[PDB]
Amino acid sequence: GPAWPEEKNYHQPAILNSSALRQIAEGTSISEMWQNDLQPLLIERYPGSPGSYAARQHIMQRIQRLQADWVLEIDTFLSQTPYGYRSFSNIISTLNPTAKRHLVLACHYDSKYFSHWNNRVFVGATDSAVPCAMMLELARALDKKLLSLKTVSDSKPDLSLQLIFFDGEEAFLHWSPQDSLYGSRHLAAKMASTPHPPGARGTSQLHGMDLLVLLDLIGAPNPTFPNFFPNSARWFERLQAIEHELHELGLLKDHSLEGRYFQNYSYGGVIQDDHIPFLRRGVPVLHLIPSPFPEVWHTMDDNEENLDESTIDNLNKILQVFVLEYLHL
Ligand SMILES: [Zn+2]
């Protein structure tokens, strides 16, 4: 300090060797995630609905049962909407809240509002129940390692982990600047105006965000994630390297390098998503959204039946390795 917000610029991974990679691949369970983390979220959960409450309680209860020292905060606020003033609640789960720096994984836990059509209900399986369940499975699978971050008299982390589950990512109607990103626009502004660490004179919680890794629209077959931003390109390249090495070790399922997920191509345009209010305030973003979107995007067919189990399993392994390497665990 006050150079500590520049540490993210020089931060390097602590790369896992083959033995450790095999351990991570064996330590995550796609069937356990499916039953215990994902299926309870495959419900109608637009903001303010009973399902939104049920989804929030589920996310909190799955984090609270873990051994690591997660601190849960519910960030509840009002916003104008096309249907008038409404309440929204982001979920923030933080290890070591006073650590200056956090790696941040995020997704949205609301589902887009639709009236029931032909007795069908929109549950947003890729969008984003699967991202939610991936974050919960990561917390569970890495629980023993994340517990070592716990602050004692001997070690106090400089860098730790935070999960954000945004409410209200979706428009109530179709997208507009005022009807979308309710939770992320609120939370980015809040973090930008909150000193961090406690007592700081001139640094905010946003300065402490090392990297925002935003998962969206994951779970369909054959996703291709572009390398959107130059100031996170080196971390995109790490995802590529992790995918390549897990592949070569035989630790991925139904996977080829020709059909790899992290491909060598950029994307010039802007995708509206929860990263935008953070990106426009200078937070580095790794946006794990596929291009093109799943074929089922914003249809009633974005459901459990159309999820690709082995692709989600593969991405769990890649993401968990990424997080351990980032945190030097
Ligand atoms: Zn959507």
What are 5's two structure tokens?
């917000």
Does 169 qualify as catalytic in the annotation?
yes
Does 216 qualify as catalytic in the annotation?
yes
CA of 127 to the centre of ligand 1 (A): 5
Question: What does the angle CA 30 – CA 33 – CA 36 come to, to the nearest 5 degrees?
Answer: 145
Using CA atoms, how far apart are residues 7 and 244, in angstroms rounded to an integer?
A: 28
Q: What is the resolution of this structure in A?
A: 1.7
Exactly one of 216, 243, 313, 325 is catalytic; which is it?
Answer: 216
Using CA atoms, how far apart are residues 55 and 138, in angstroms rounded to an integer?
A: 18
Place of tokens 């992790």: 242
Question: Which residues sit with Cβ closer than 5 angstroms to ligand 1, an ion?
Answer: 127
CA of 65 to the centre of ligand 1 (A): 29
CB atoms within 10 A of CB 98: 14
CA of 144 to the centre of ligand 1 (A): 33
Cα distances (Å, whole numbers) of residue 219 to 21, 165, 262: 22, 17, 15
**CATH superfamily entry for domain 4-150+159-327:** Zn peptidases (3.40.630.10)
CA of 327 to the centre of ligand 1 (A): 30
Helical axes 233-248 vs 18-27, angle rounded to 10°: 90
Exactly one of 110, 169, 273, 308 is catalytic; which is it?
Answer: 169
Binding-site residues: 127, 170, 298
The full set of domain ranges for the chain reads: 4-150+159-327
> Which technique was used to obtain these atomic coordinates?
X-ray
CA of 93 to the centre of ligand 1 (A): 23
Binding-site residues for Zn(2+): 127, 170, 298
Using CA atoms, how far apart are residues 219 and 124, in angstroms rounded to an integer?
A: 10
